[PDB]
Paper text:
The HIV type 1 (HIV-1) envelope glycoprotein (Env) is the sole antigen on the surface of the virion and has evolved several tactics for evading the adaptive immune system, chief among which is extensive surface glycosylation (1–3). Env has one of the highest densities of N-linked glycosylation sites known, with glycans accounting for ∼1/2 the mass of the molecule. We chose BG505 SOSIP.664 as a model system to demonstrate our approach because it is the first and most widely studied of the soluble prefusion stabilized Envs. The RM20A3 Fab was included because it improves orientation bias, and binds to a nonnative epitope at the base of the SOSIP trimer, thus leaving the native glycan shield undisturbed.
The global resolution of this C3-symmetric reconstruction determined by Fourier shell correlation (FSC) is ∼3.1 Å, and the bulk of the protein is at or near this resolution. Approximately 80% of Env residues could be confidently built into this map, while most glycans are ill-defined beyond the core N-acetylglucosamine (NAG), accounting for only ∼15% of the total predicted glycan mass. Glycans located on the poorly resolved flexible loops (N185e, N185h, N398, N406, N411, and N462) could not be identified at all; however, site-specific MS data confirmed they are indeed glycosylated. Of those we could identify, a few were found to be near-uniformly processed (>75% complex), for example the glycans at N611 and N618 on gp41, and it should be possible to confirm this by the presence of a core fucose residue. However, we were unable to identify clear density for fucose at any of these sites. Together, these observations show that the glycan shield is highly dynamic with respect to the protein core but exhibits some differences in ordering between glycans, and that it is not possible to distinguish between the different types of glycans from a single cryo-EM map when the glycans are not stabilized by antibodies. To make direct comparisons with the experimental data, we built and relaxed glycan stems into the 1.5-SD Gaussian filtered BG505_293F map and could identify clear density at 21/28 glycosylation sites per monomer, two fewer than from the simulated map (N398 and N426). In the BG505_293F map, the N262 glycan was the most ordered due to stabilizing contacts with the gp120 core, and these interactions may not have been accurately captured by the simulation given the restricted protein dynamics.
Numbering used by the authors:
A (entry chain H): 1 to 52, 52A, 53 to 82, 82A, 82B, 82C, 83 to 100, 100A, ...
B (entry chain A): 35 to 57, 66 to 141, 150 to 185, 187 to 309, 312 to 323, 323A, 324 to 396, 412 to 458, ...
C (entry chain B), D (entry chain B), E (entry chain B): 519 to 545, 568 to 661
The structure:
């Protein structure tokens, strides 16, 4: 049993900023790469960002590439996602998930093993 | 898939040349690297390594290094060729105890002076063991005259067994086994890497091992093959036995010039009376110690076996007695008083002293040990034994020795030399 | 943390973070000669390894990812066993017999790469 | 122009154009031993510097731009003073006490870079 | 196929596929000294060539494509004659007198390249 719990504010003005976070437990945090996936209010899933297990390498979807920052702290078992600028198009549920990458010295994943329940963020 | 790694912690058994390091010596003088005041030791977790003290080439290197240093230290000293002459000898009879009757000879001879035109009549004292009667009942020659040239050790170079540290060259490492109750062979856990060995004192002796290291917990019996009576058994004590040796004779020294810039150091008259050299071993301590040794021998020979100790078998003086160098003089002590028991104040061991010494097992290179003035007193630790098994309900153990490698094997048993092999490959999941 | 060879009993993926620890430890006339021979040898051994990395295209690196595939016949194990259970001493024994094959393949793929890169310029 | 060490009294930015001048100058039995020791040492010193550049990721270069930030506490000066007024001898004295700190940081950033580059492949 | 120097009589373009063959072959006290001198020299010669490749920007390579143009005065021949008819021994004689000029140019273009690459970072 593992848990991923998203926290963070859910209501912002466009043009502002928002920081979300995700507390993990039940597994070695430091052994896994992690990512964020959005669920549009009425559509499907979209990948947004990915961070390596050691925190050194980050990747983004083009639509947030110059706006969002993904960060990790392995001593607290947490992820964070720092949003800036914010658009109406960014309204979504943001899910914390474990998987996405690999560490090249272990079997690859390229899929998401665990999901949290998601933080809801609305841009007004 | 193949990924190359360099700096991989892998090693193989290897033999290399180790160098000496150290903190007027015979051995390590200036041809020796100053030591590191804060040497390192690294414990290796989860490493099991096989050691074999009987195949350890560090022993062969130490044997060779000390012999070569010994010879280099005599090479520049005075040759005593002029001394191999006919001697006219009588007995030293002045205030002699019974134990010393016939031990000292008062010999006169015609010696070379600085000038080639002149000779001098001189005399000196020799021990009975240094001379041979020839023919004229007073005529003698030195013992080495029909065998070898003899040189005089330079009386400025001490024989003190100052400790030597062996250090590995780069690319190599010395592994140390810290497993207590390690018997010299097989695998052991608790292995650490060290830069250098601890200091090892090159103490030369037979039968009894002096001034060495002690076992951490129990007396240990180590042998190449415990059931092979042709092999020696090394015994390491977990406590020292103190031994006190002396030459209670106030000797004087005289210098006889034998040429332009050379002199012979002769024993002159002796002040006071004449007494036998001897060593004292505390009796109770010896008995307790011997107690522990037998308890451990029983583990290999049976606890219903009768273990007997006996004195040495015949052979030369260098083999049958306890030979050691202390105070600058060479003693040959009778250990039959220590090894005379079934199963298990002070014990006095009488000793003989020689001036003409043939080191190790060589023939052809003799040395003369200059006499030491005054009275000699030595205090040392017996830290172990060399035993040989004489062999159906009983076993007899006797003192052994004469092969110096056995005295270093007892200190170097914990060390192994390995070679570092930094490259390796392994599958990874990446592509150039 | 650990000093020289302190990672020897660690697994392959725990080790291989200490590569600089080991790399840096590789650097009377009779005594003079014995020591010069020891020093000259240490240099010669060092240079042979560096030359070898060079011809494989790994000069200047401690970790070099190559373009040669791994034959399953050399060691049919998954990354999990190799990097998480095994130590480097154990691994070295397991594939000792394939070392020369692997080295030959590494040299050859570099020769081909080096030439292709010339033709592209 | 200038030969070996001719730039020693020049400023740091005037010098550092002569790096190949200095780099190329680094290359009876008793006399034989004394000279072999001198030659062996010159080789060993050369190789230690090359090994060190290698672990910092600067192999094969005379000028190597790294990814370590400069702490103002090591030397609180502007580029104008360092490169236009100071000589290398003066600079070496000014930051002598920070040399080992800087070297440790250079080794560590290379270890991290080298691993990140493996994960990306 | 061929071993050491087996390509010596081959043409320049047939040879130059064997570069690793030759590169790998470059690695009583009186006898000890004579042999140490021979070994020390082999190391010193090896390192001078490696240092030289380094300052030209060719470290770690057997074939290094540079940014210096070829003056027709050094050898006015087409690629067909040089690579298909000539051997390396013949070529070495043909351009012996221009070796130092070429080496000076290689060092200088690397110094300029190395600095331009610093300014771009
Ligand atoms: C086992 O270890 C013990 C402990 O180290 C060792 O005994 C020691 O031996 C040395 C040397 O024999 C003793 O030191 C001597 O003490 C006398 C005392 O008057 C001094 O005169 C001696 O100096 C003379 O020799 C020097 C040589 O360089 C000259 O420079 C000097 O001018 C003098 O001529 C010397 O200091 C030391 O006291 C004993 N220690 C004890 C406790 O007796 C023992 O020998 C070791 N066992 C063996 C077999 O070696
Ligand atoms: C050893 O013999 C010598 C003689 O060769 C003894 O020396 C002589 O002793 C007498 C005693 O009255 C003196 O008068 C002589 O002058 C001594 N001779 C010399 C040359 O000095 C010597 O005492 C004997 N030594 C021992 C220990 O007996
Ligand atoms: C040197 O002389 C000694 C003394 O005579 C010789 O050794 C003796 O050899 C006989 C032979 O039967 C033995 O009985 C003696 O016991 C030996 N004496 C000693 C003191 O050992 C010795 O062999 C001679 N050496 C040479 C090379 O001729
Ligand atoms: C060592 O000392 C012992 C006694 O202290 C000597 O033993 C004597 O040896 C002779 C030889 O036949 C025997 O007849 C005596 O009975 C022995 N005495 C005892 C008490 O057993 C021994 O010879 C000495 N050894 C040496 C090498 O001198
Ligand atoms: C005999 O062994 C004892 C015990 O190992 C030695 O005494 C120790 O020497 C060390 C040296 O620093 C001291 O730290 C210990 O405290 C000593 N122990 C005792 C009980 O004093 C002793 O020196 C050895 N004797 C000789 C002659 O070496
Ligand atoms: C024995 O010692 C005494 C002590 O003075 C001395 O007078 C005597 O002459 C000595 N004996 C001999 C034979 O010298
Ligand atoms: C010397 O003492 C020994 C002791 O046995 C004796 O046999 C010998 O004859 C003595 N020599 C002289 C010259 O008195
Ligand atoms: C010394 O030489 C003389 C010469 O005749 C001789 O008579 C004398 O006995 C010799 N001395 C000794 C002690 O041999
Ligand atoms: C030492 O321990 C090993 C461990 O297997 C054993 O085989 C060997 O016989 C022991 N040595 C002796 C002398 O018993
Ligand atoms: C140990 O000695 C006995 C004595 O005969 C011999 O049979 C045995 O083979 C020896 N052990 C080894 C390992 O050689
Ligand atoms: C040995 O013990 C005897 C007993 O009287 C004593 O006289 C002698 O001095 C002791 N020897 C040593 C070296 O302590
Ligand atoms: C050796 O001498 C010391 C000096 O104090 C003494 O305490 C010790 O008991 C002596 N040992 C023997 C065996 O006499
Ligand atoms: C040595 O220990 C044995 C054990 O039985 C004892 O009988 C013997 O008397 C002891 N010897 C001494 C000198 O204490
Ligand atoms: C020796 O003591 C051990 C201790 O357990 C025991 O097992 C063994 O049978 C004993 N041997 C004899 C001969 O009594
Ligand atoms: C050992 O003791 C016996 C007892 O008779 C003796 O004959 C023998 O010579 C002694 N061994 C030595 C080397 O003294
Ligand atoms: C050996 O022990 C016996 C027991 O009485 C004793 O008489 C004999 O003298 C001892 N031997 C030695 C050399 O001390
Ligand atoms: C030896 O004799 C000399 C003569 O003066 C004396 O000074 C010295 O103290 C004596 N040595 C001993 C140990 O008695
Ligand atoms: C040794 O093995 C234990 C077993 O879990 C492991 O935890 C420890 O870290 C290992 N040692 C090293 C240096 O990793
Ligand atoms: C793998 O090795 C086997 C022999 O062990 C060989 O026949 C096979 O062709 C190799 N596979 C590849 C892809 O080279
Ligand atoms: C992969 O790892 C598992 C461990 O769970 C092992 O049982 C399996 O044999 C491995 N696969 C291969 C290629 O052997
Ligand atoms: C390999 O390491 C993993 C790490 O959790 C462990 O669970 C597994 O049992 C290990 N396998 C072996 C064969 O030691
Ligand atoms: C390597 O060769 C030896 C030769 O006997 C063989 O026993 C061993 O199994 C071989 N190793 C492998 C991995 O096949
Ligand atoms: C020496 O200092 C003067 C001062 O301006 C400067 O012009 C000159 O170029 C300096 N020397 C060198 C080698 O630059
Ligand atoms: C700069 O150095 C000081 C100590 O001199 C240290 O406390 C500080 O954290 C360093 N700054 C950085 C960015 O590392
Ligand atoms: C920058 O340079 C000027 C020289 O005009 C100097 O006065 C100033 O102190 C420098 N800044 C720092 C960081 O010291
Ligand atoms: C530093 O160099 C500039 C170059 O023009 C000069 O003006 C300035 O005075 C120099 N500063 C010092 C402190 O020498
Ligand atoms: C370097 O250490 C010495 C030690 O006394 C100190 O005086 C000096 O100022 C230090 N250098 C710097 C730049 O702080
Ligand atoms: C030697 O010359 C002949 C002439 O055609 C050529 O075919 C042959 O291959 C040459 N040798 C080598 C090693 O190429
Ligand atoms: C070619 O070399 C000649 C002299 O041999 C020289 O004058 C000419 O400028 C060189 N050409 C180039 C492009 O450097
Ligand atoms: C080019 O090659 C041809 C060979 O057909 C030769 O005749 C001609 O001279 C070459 N050109 C030059 C630059 O010499
Ligand atoms: C150069 O090689 C070509 C290859 O076909 C050959 O035809 C030509 O004749 C050769 N030229 C010379 C001068 O050897
Ligand atoms: C190289 O110099 C020598 C000197 O005599 C000359 O003969 C030769 O032709 C020169 N080589 C070239 C290619 O010009």
């Amino acid at each position: 049993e593992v848990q991923l719990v998203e926290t963070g504010g859910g209501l912002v003005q466009p043009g502002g900023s928002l920081k979300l976070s995700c507390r993990a437990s039940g597994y070695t945090f430091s052994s896994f790469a992690m990512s964020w996936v959005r669920q549009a209010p009425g559509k499907g899933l979209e990948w947004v960002s990915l961070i390596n297990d050691r925190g050194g390498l980050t990747f983004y979807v083009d639509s947030v590439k110059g706006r969002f920052t993904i960060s990790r702290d392995n001593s607290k078992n947490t992820l964070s996602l720092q949003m800036h600028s914010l658009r109406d198009g960014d309204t979504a549920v943001y899910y914390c998930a474990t998987g996405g990458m690999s560490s090249a010295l272990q079997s690859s994943k390229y899929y998401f093993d665990f999901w949290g329940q998601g933080a809801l963020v609305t841009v007004s | 898939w193949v990924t190359v790694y360099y700096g991989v912690p892998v090693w193989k058994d290897a033999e290399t040349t180790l160098f000496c390091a150290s903190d007027h010596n015979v051995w390590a003088t200036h041809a020796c690297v100053p030591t590191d005041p804060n040497p390192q030791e690294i414990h290796l977790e989860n490493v099991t390594e096989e050691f074999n003290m009987w195949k350890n080439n560090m022993v062969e290197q130490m044997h060779t290094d000390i012999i070569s240093l010994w010879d280099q230290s005599l090479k520049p000293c005075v040759k005593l060729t002029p001394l191999c002459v006919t001697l006219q000898c009588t007995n030293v009879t002045n205030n002699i105890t019974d134990d010393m009757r016939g031990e000292l000879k008062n010999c006169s001879f015609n010696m070379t002076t600085e000038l080639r035109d002149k000779k001098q009549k001189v005399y000196s004292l020799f021990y009975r063991l240094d001379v041979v009667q020839i023919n004229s009942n007073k005529e003698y020659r030195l013992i080495n005259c029909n065998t070898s040239a003899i040189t005089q050790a330079c009386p400025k170079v001490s024989f003190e067994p100052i400790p030597i540290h062996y250090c590995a060259p780069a690319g190599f490492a010395i592994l140390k086994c810290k497993d207590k109750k390690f018997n010299g062979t097989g695998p052991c856990p608790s292995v650490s890497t060290v830069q250098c060995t601890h200091g090892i004192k090159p103490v030369v002796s037979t039968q009894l091992l002096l001034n060495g290291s002690l076992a951490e917990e129990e007396v240990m019996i180590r042998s190449e093959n415990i059931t092979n009576n042709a092999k020696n058994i090394l015994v390491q004590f977990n406590t020292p036995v103190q031994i006190n040796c002396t030459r209670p004779n106030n000797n004087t020294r005289k210098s006889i010039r034998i040429g332009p810039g050379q002199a012979f150091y002769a024993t002159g008259d002796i002040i006071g009376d004449i007494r036998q050299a001897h060593c004292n071993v505390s009796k109770a301590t010896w008995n307790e110690t011997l107690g522990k040794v037998v308890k451990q021998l029983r583990k290999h020979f049976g606890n219903n076996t009768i273990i007997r100790f006996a004195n040495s078998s015949g052979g030369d003086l260098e083999v049958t007695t306890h030979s050691f160098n202390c105070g600058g003089e060479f003693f040959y002590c009778n250990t039959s008083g220590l090894f005379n028991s079934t199963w298990i104040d002070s014990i006095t061991l009488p000793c003989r002293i020689k001036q003409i010494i043939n080191m190790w097992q060589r023939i052809g290179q003799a040395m003369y040990a200059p006499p030491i003035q005054g009275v000699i007193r030595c205090v040392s630790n017996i830290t172990g034994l060399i035993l040989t098994r004489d062999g159906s309900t009983t076993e007899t153990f006797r003192p052994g020795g004469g092969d110096m490698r056995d005295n270093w094997r007892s200190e170097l048993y914990k060390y192994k030399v390995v070679k570092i092999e930094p490259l390796g490959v392994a599958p990874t999941r990446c592509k150039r | 943390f650990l000093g020289f060879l302190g990672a020897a009993g660690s697994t392959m993926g725990a080790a291989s973070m200490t590569l600089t620890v080991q790399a840096r430890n590789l650097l009377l006339t009779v005594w003079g000669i014995k020591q010069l021979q020891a020093r000259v040898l240490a240099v010669e051994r060092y240079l042979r390894d560096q030359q070898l990395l060079g011809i494989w295209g790994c000069s200047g690196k401690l970790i070099c990812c190559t373009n040669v595939p791994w034959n399953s016949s050399w060691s049919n194990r998954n990354l999990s066993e190799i990097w998480d259970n095994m130590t480097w001493l154990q691994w070295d024994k397991e594939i000792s017999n394939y070392t020369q094959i692997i080295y030959g393949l590494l040299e050859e793929s570099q020769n081909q790469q080096e030439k292709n890169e010339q033709d592209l310029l």
